[PDB]
């Protein structure tokens, strides 16, 4: 399988597929809890 | 067509416009919007403006050279789609407009909001103790208590607001299991590593890459809903991906993944986020005159208002279940 380690920053988006609608985008710079 | 294809790819031409603007303007590690809840609060207020007011409310919009009505039940027909698509994911879409008691505010822009946006309406008396938690509590009951405060000070002359409250809890189509979760290290944007709760699962999810980055799809509920991740290979930037990011790329992106069996590695991870977007970031989208003295509100009332503030705020969590997020946009006018 292909190895997708997200182990530094990243750009992520929630999106609707019947719209193409993108709810949410951002990046993530620093992991919070 | 315009009123449908056309409008999706503006909407998210917006969405990336937003993104890009927002990163420009801010200095955190964490960026978190959404341009579903900004353009939502801000074409209800556009209901009201005239002249250059909606001209400019429009271009900063991606909306240029669509009516109000088409606006409307363009978002109308939106808004009712992600409401009823999935059953198994949990959707808030939620509007309201606070208005000060005794003014005349017109009954057609109350009408179209009420009709179009499923508007909340009421006349508060924003000198009463109780109205900021009655509007911060509206807050808190659309996002389940995940954004409890959009406000913390009603200014003396406030006359309206129009607030917005997206809400989203979906779960997995494969979730990790707690148990598989590792301690591992993460490198941060600033360069320093942490430690981070590590996620870890083996699955067929979509996949595709170019050449700057891999992508992944994660999909929630019945598949209508999903999140999509962008990895820049090593040597490669997340703010390189932001600055190239527009309809086209995201075309591609969405038209090449392929079901593929993957190595998934996901850090469990929250971000809460707050923007004046009326500060730096509306105005340089072209956003201007509503802002000032010369704004043209005669929809609302025949009284001179203006937008004082565009306040935006979001929440993430991402688990092994699933994702919960949130975003509230208020428009304050005076
Ligand atoms: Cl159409
Ligand atoms: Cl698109
Ligand atoms: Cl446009
Ligand atoms: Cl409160
Ligand atoms: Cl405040
Ligand atoms: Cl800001
Ligand atoms: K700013
Ligand atoms: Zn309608
Ligand atoms: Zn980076």
């Known amino acids: 399988p292909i190895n997708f380690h997200i182990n530094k920053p990243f750009v992520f988006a929630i999106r609707e597929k019947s719209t193409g609608v993108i709810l949410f985008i951002g990046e993530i710079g620093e992991v919070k809890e | ?111 179209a909001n009420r009709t179009h946006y499923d508007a909340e309406v009421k006349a508060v008396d924003f000198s009463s103790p109780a109205t900021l938690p009655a509007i911060n509590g509206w807050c808190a009951q659309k996002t389940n208590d995940k954004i409890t405060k959009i406000l913390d000070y009603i200014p003396g002359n406030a006359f ?53 980055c891999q992508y992944l799809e994660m999909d929630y509920g019945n598949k209508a809903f999903s999140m999509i991740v962008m990895l820049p290979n090593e040597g490669q930037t997340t703010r390189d991906v932001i600055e190239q990011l527009d309809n086209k790329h995201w075309s591609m992106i969405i038209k090449g993944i392929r079901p593929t069996q993957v190595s998934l590695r996901m850090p469990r991870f929250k971000t809460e986020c707050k923007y004046g977007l009326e500060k730096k970031i509306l105005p340089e989208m072209g956003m201007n005159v509503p802002f000032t003295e010369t704004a043209d509100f005669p929809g609302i009332t025949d009284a001179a208002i203006f937008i004082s503030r565009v306040i935006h705020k979001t929440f993430v969590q991402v688990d092994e279940e699933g994702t919960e997020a949130a975003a509230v946009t208020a428009v304050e006018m005076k």
């Open chain 2, 1 to 111: 067509g315009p009123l449908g294809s056309e409008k999706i790819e503006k909407d998210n031409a917006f969405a990336f416009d937003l993104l890009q603007t927002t990163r420009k303007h801010v200095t955190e590690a964490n960026v978190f919007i959404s341009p579903l809840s900004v353009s939502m609060a801000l074409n209800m207020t556009l209901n009201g403006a005239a002249g250059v007011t909606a001209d400019e409310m429009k271009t900063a919009l991606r909306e240029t050279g669509y009516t109000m009505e088409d606006i409307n039940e363009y978002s109308h027909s939106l808004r009712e789609a992600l409401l009823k698509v999935d059953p198994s994911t949990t959707i808030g879409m939620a509007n309201s407009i606070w208005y000060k008691q005794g003014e005349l505010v017109k009954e057609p822009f109350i009408l």
């Open chain 2, 160 to 212: 309206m607001y129009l607030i917005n409250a997206v809400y989203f809890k979906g779960i997995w189509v494969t979730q990790f299991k707690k148990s598989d979760t590792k301690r591992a290290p993460f490198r941060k944007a600033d360069g320093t590593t942490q430690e981070v709760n590590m996620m870890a699962q083996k699955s067929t999810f979509g996949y595709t890459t170019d050449e700057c």
